[PDB]
Structure 1
Amino acid sequence: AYECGKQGGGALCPNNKCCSRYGYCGFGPAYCGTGCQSGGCCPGKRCGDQANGETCPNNLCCSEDGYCGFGSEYCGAGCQGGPCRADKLCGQLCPDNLCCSQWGFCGLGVEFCGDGCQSGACCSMRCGRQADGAKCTNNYCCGASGYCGLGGDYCGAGCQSGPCT
């Protein structure tokens, strides 16, 4: 029955719905208030230096004061995680599986994850006996056919390296 959070295998709700303390999605005090696991919690979940380096779920911004939300108070000056308005440098893996572009910036989409992607959720990174025994970054699995990724297709049968099985 559970939809989200610890009870639902770490799933997130869609469209910023709060995951209640019991593992169901919705809005209002029962979901977003005390015990809120993810989504648009009110107040925002603690993050960053104020929570042992935890990032915000759902790609929220971590404010200077270590709360998760959106808007200039969260993503602007002093933003310490998520989609901050400042460019995010990398070389230092990107947080939350963001791609480190050829040019050393974090993001998602082909400009970041496509050709020249260094790390994170790259589109097509080669590994294993297909790529000279090359290793995957981010502790991803090398798949049977020599692509880096995660999930059963890469970590399951024929997995060459990384956290197989």
Structure 2
Amino acid sequence: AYECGKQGGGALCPNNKCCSRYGYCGFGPAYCGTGCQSGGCCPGKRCGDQANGETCPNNLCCSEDGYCGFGSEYCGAGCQGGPCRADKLCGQLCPDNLCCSQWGFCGLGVEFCGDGCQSGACCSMRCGRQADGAKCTNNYCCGASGYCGLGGDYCGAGCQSGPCT
């Protein structure tokens, strides 16, 4: 049974484990080297302006030079994406389903996803019949009971709008 990557339904490995070209999790050249799909690849996966705007998997930072990693060389000056040290503006959805707060910054946690959340993975956004026909942002599904989200509970039976079924 595959664990990760294109063989494993796009799953990631935990704790920065590399997903090999064959869809298994580990560390060392066999996993992190040629063909590495995600995790702490070496070299890092290509990203940003150097790779058609692709983001890094596992919330790695995209360096100025368009490689995925962590540390100041990746997250600091010139960082193109992921958890860059610079605040990330939005209003222009946040990458990778991050919440755009009421104040126009990207993040996760209640301060971003809770009250006033504009877009991304908001805690509770109403939609459909139950909200005057409001549509979900981010091409999320409206669930049968009028909350925005993804996965079967929202896109499955009952789904009111967005990429249902």
TM-score, with structure 2 as normaliser: 1.00
Q: Give the Cα separation in 1 of the matches to 2:116 and 2:80.
A: 26
Where does the alignment leave 5 or more consecutive residues of structure 1 unmatched? none
Report the equivalent of 1:68: 68
CA deviations over 1:89-109 (Å, ceiling 9, x no partner): 000000000000000000000
Q: Give the Cα separation in 2 of the matches to 1:50 and 1:69.
A: 15
CA deviations over 1:14-48 (Å, ceiling 9, x no partner): 00000000000000000000000000000000001
User: What is the Cα deviation at residue 84 of structure 1?
Assistant: 0.1
| Count of equivalent residues | 165
Please state if 1:86 is matched with 2:86. yes
CA deviations over 1:39-64 (Å, ceiling 9, x no partner): 00000000011111100000000000
User: What is the Cα deviation at residue 9 of structure 1?
Assistant: 0.3
Q: Which runs of 4+ in 1 moved over 6 A?
A: none
Q: Give the Cα separation in 2 of the matches to 1:16 and 1:44.
A: 12
Q: Give the Cα separation in 2 of the matches to 1:109 and 1:43.
A: 31
User: What is the Cα deviation at residue 159 of structure 1?
Assistant: 0.2
TM-score, with structure 1 as normaliser: 1.00
